[PDB]
Amino acid sequence: KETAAAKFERQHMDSSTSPASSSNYCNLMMCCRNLTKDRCKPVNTFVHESLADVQAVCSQKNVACKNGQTNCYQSYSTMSITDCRETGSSKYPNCAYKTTQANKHIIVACEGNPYVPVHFDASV
Amino acid sequence: KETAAAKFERQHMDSSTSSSNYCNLMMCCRNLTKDRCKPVNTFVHESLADVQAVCSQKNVACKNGQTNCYQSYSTMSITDCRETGSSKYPNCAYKTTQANKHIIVACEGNPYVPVHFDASV
Ligand SMILES: OC[C@H]1O[C@H](O[C@H]2O[C@H](CO)[C@@H](O)[C@H](O)[C@H]2O)[C@H](O)[C@@H](O)[C@@H]1O
């Protein structure tokens, strides 16, 4: 007869394999989004909030951009994001990244009509 | 030529709300849809040793009052499964949501191991 402990393992345990682990999220996404095609992009950030919530940032807190322009905006609240940073052994075309999930305000630059995000400037 | 807005979406967006068929398949493979659709379930993605170790972490009260519940000191990778509105046995359908949260389990036995999933917080 199935033991209570085995029933809990059947109902609730599914330990991730290494390829399916979140630690490998960046390696997969940086490749699938074509950010490693010509060389390894050093750092990148993915935002997991809805597109509506990210586009809304263009009407939130105006802050200075790192480059000096004034079309940057910081979200009023933190957002779910994943930060990808190239590992020391990374070497194009075998790009390799460390993945870090976090909750931070984002800063993007906006442009256009409609005024929407066109550059990701920072997380904070 | 890809627009600037499109390039931003491709480089930076990965919106979590609309493993999409993960729950559909895991619920059926673990026999949780055999006679009826189980309405909700949670799967934990840490190692079995790390989950069993929770039985000696923070002792807390279970939702029903039992004193044998334990909360993980650290958050854990889990997936929550919830039946959608279209779901209907024998065509059970689930929404899959990934999270990183502390888990609470009730433990019993010798060795003292989890026997019930009580909550995630
Ligand atoms: O089975 C996974 C779910 O476990 C908990 O929810 C169940 O157990 C609770 C305590 O007995 C009940 O109150 C609840 O109605 C059950 O569905 C947990 O709270 C859920 O988050 C898990 O998905």
From Swiss-Prot, chain A:
Keywords: Disulfide bond, Endonuclease, Glycation, Glycoprotein, Hydrolase, Lyase, Nuclease, Secreted, Signal. It is an enzyme of class 4 (lyase). Glycans are attached at K1, K7, N34, K37, K41. It comes from the Eukaryota. One of its GO terms (cellular component) is extracellular region. Interacts with and forms tight 1:1 complexes with RNH1. Dimerization of two such complexes may occur. Interaction with RNH1 inhibits this protein. Monomer. Belongs to the pancreatic ribonuclease family. This is Ribonuclease pancreatic. The lineage of its organism: Eukaryota, Metazoa, Chordata, Craniata, Vertebrata. The chain holds residues 27 to 150 of 150 of the full protein.
Curated annotation (Swiss-Prot), chain B:
Endonuclease that catalyzes the cleavage of RNA on the 3' side of pyrimidine nucleotides. Acts on single-stranded and double-stranded RNA. The chain holds residues 27 to 150 of 150 of the full protein. It comes from Bos taurus (Bovine). It is an enzyme of class 4 (lyase). Coiled coil: none annotated. The lineage of its organism: Eukaryota, Metazoa, Chordata, Craniata, Vertebrata. Its EC number is 4.6.1.18. Substrate binds at K7, R10, K38, P39, V40, N41, T42, K63, R82. The active site is at H12 (proton acceptor), H116 (proton donor). This is Ribonuclease pancreatic. The gene is RNASE1. GO terms for molecular function: lyase activity; nucleic acid binding; ribonuclease A activity; RNA nuclease activity.
